[PDB]
Amino acid sequence: SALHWRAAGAATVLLVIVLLAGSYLAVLAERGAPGAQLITYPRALWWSVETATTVGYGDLYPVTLWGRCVAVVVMVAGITSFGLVTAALATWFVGREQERRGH
Amino acid sequence: SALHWRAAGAATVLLVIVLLAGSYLAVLAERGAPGAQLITYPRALWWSVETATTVGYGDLYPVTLWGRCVAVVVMVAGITSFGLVTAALATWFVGREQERRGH
Amino acid sequence: SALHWRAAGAATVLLVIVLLAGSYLAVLAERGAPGAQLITYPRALWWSVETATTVGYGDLYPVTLWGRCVAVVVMVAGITSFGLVTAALATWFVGREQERRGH
Amino acid sequence: SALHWRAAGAATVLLVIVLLAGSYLAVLAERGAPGAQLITYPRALWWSVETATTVGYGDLYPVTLWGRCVAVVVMVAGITSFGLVTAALATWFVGREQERRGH
Amino acid sequence: DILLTQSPAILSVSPGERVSFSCRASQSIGTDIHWYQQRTNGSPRLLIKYASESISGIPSRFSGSGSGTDFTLSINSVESEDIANYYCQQSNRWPFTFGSGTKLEI
Amino acid sequence: DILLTQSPAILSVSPGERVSFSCRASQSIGTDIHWYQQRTNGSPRLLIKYASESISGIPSRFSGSGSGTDFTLSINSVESEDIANYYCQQSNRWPFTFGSGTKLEI
């Protein structure tokens, strides 16, 4: 069907996959760094959610190079995906307003 | 009237309801977890506002599974709703520019 | 001239005014609360900037009812205004693409 | 080619340059302030990334006037640039929906 | 759990004097401390909430102060009806905890 | 690394009594503490996870409590099979570390 909704759906699936792989890779990256808290899977999934939404409480965060690269991918993907939803909503509203006008 | 403004209005009412229910459910989820700070209603409402806007100072945050699920719903709803406002503004601007052009 | 750019300009002036009034009112609200850090004007202006952009480091934050209401106005205004810039850019791009197509 | 994609590309290059110059200038601004943590280049680059995406964990932040001005430029540029991507996606979706409609 | 230390355990004072009860938290708890008075054979009665807020019906004699880890309940001009046990209570972190009590003696 | 102090090193108790083992962390670690029992010549056996969570197969006798820096393993009504060494373990920060051990004596 319509491209904007296909892309939204696709954005959401991709984001879920990035969260899950980010959790797994953050733990991998961070274990072996003294002081690191981002080292068990359940809180890593939480950490990646709060990073993707860009909420970032500061209860958890990577301290290594690769953990931080992982973090950046997660941010970019959360911001991008949510941006894509906004874009798709604007396409929807614009098309319906063209109609309501008779255009 | 116009769909974009109806949806904006509706987004705002929904968000208010999510804030209020999120506050109530965060306290419910978090009491009974030793160390949890997200346990009284007034600061829970504040916490949910700063989570929906994605500001996340780190003065308060859930530590349980359900508290964190609650947190995710609040984030998604704040981001989504504010995104919907941006979408509705873009529809408004686009329609007015079509006019100013004579289209 | 064009509505989207007028509104962007206007959004930016309003936001500057909200930052400044928010700084002044946050200090007003927060002095007299034991433990409050949001109590001098220069760091209050910084705090309001990092709140409007929704960055929220957690170095500073209100602890009173009115300080927190002030905080909410600042968030809503920063998110709204930056959203309005995105909207105005989308109007600009859409109009230029209609042209490039011959429509 | 199309303006929206040119601007997206350009936004991304500009943002990379702002991150890099922000890291360098934050260290410059912050050394010489007792207590400042934002004082070596690698963590400064990380700090500027988490500021541009507006994630702001609170592990690092400027404490001087110029460091904070630097921080503001970085925020505005990250928000603006990501906003520009959303705008460009909305232009793309709108144009494809006009087509799918036969308009 | 947050430990609330109240020392001294007993406080002797002469009538009309100003008295200060101490409450120390084992970690920082902003202003989330409340104070209760319990007379012989009575139930506890709230005096001060959030470290310094008045309750209606409590004599103006009673005030509170402090934040972070150090809290004070004060009585301007002690009188006989103030002979009681005095407890602090924290609501910063789960579970809520009580201090061990200061007895007031005249 | 996080230091986990367990004092006393040995604990003497009479049968059927309630016993409490102490574990103190050198910094705050929420509830990320787990407890192990090791009998003479046996391997360690998990008793309690995340400071208070039951494991299946462990007698209801055993409970845990605490958060932040102070942790307690408790046994309601000690009996002979509880004679063992008892260790705490933290998973808040890398690397995982163990406490030094409390021996239970009846």
Ligand SMILES: CCCCCCCCCCCC(=O)OC[C@H](CO)OC(=O)CCCCCCCC
């Ligand atoms: C890469 C693999 C990722 C696997 C992660 C799966 C965790 C989810 C459920 C497991 C149940 C459990 O025992 O966790 C809850 C825990 C209770 O001890 O408290 C927790 O705080 C877990 C926090 C997880 C919050 C995630 C919210 C995201 C929507």
Ligand SMILES: CCCCCCCCCCCC(=O)OC[C@H](CO)OC(=O)CCCCCCCC
């Ligand atoms: C699910 C039910 C939610 C009910 C919450 C209602 C709280 C609001 C007013 C009650 C007055 C009060 O005594 O709170 C202010 C308090 C003063 O002690 O300080 C506080 O800091 C309260 C913080 C609340 C900030 C909310 C700002 C959101 C726009």
Ligand SMILES: CCCCCCCCCCCC(=O)OC[C@H](CO)OC(=O)CCCCCCCC
């Ligand atoms: C409602 C009135 C608001 C007035 C605030 C004006 C402050 C600005 C300049 C004054 C110079 C000064 O002595 O501040 C810098 C200070 C040096 O001691 O360090 C500081 O950290 C000041 C932080 C302010 C950062 C603001 C960045 C916003 C773009």
Ligand SMILES: CCCCCCCCCCCC(=O)OC[C@H](CO)OC(=O)CCCCCCCC
């Ligand atoms: C203005 C000049 C900027 C130069 C900064 C270059 C740093 C990058 C690589 C150098 C390797 C190194 O030794 O850093 C990794 C370090 C290992 O000790 O741990 C670190 O944590 C470095 C954190 C950097 C995270 C950046 C992620 C951004 C996508």
Ligand SMILES: CCCC[N+](CCCC)(CCCC)CCCC
């Ligand atoms: C100035 C606020 C902009 C913050 N946003 C959207 C606000 C959410 C209420 C975060 C969305 C990310 C999921 C934009 C990202 C900024 C890079």
Ligand SMILES: CCCCCCCCCO
């Ligand atoms: C840049 C994101 C890819 C992840 C980098 C490596 C993953 C962890 C390696 O140990």
Ligand SMILES: CCCCCCCCCO
């Ligand atoms: C996923 C959001 C629904 C809330 C989950 C349960 C609420 C708290 C239960 O105690």
Ligand SMILES: CCCCCCCCCO
């Ligand atoms: C809701 C924002 C208006 C500010 C509320 C009062 C300002 C501080 C009062 O002391």
Ligand SMILES: CCCCCCCCCO
């Ligand atoms: C406003 C951003 C420009 C940077 C200000 C000065 C840079 C650091 C000076 O030491």
Ligand SMILES: CCCCCCC
């Ligand atoms: C090497 C593959 C990158 C994983 C995605 C990061 C979230």
Ligand SMILES: CCCCCCC
């Ligand atoms: C079970 C209903 C969910 C409540 C909304 C979460 C904010």
Ligand SMILES: CCCCCCC
């Ligand atoms: C009472 C006027 C409100 C001030 C704006 C808050 C930033």
Ligand SMILES: CCCCCCC
């Ligand atoms: C003086 C030039 C400003 C540098 C850009 C700040 C990131």
Ligand SMILES: [Co+2]
């Ligand atoms: Co047309």
Ligand SMILES: [K+]
């Ligand atoms: K944010």
Ligand SMILES: [K+]
């Ligand atoms: K944030």
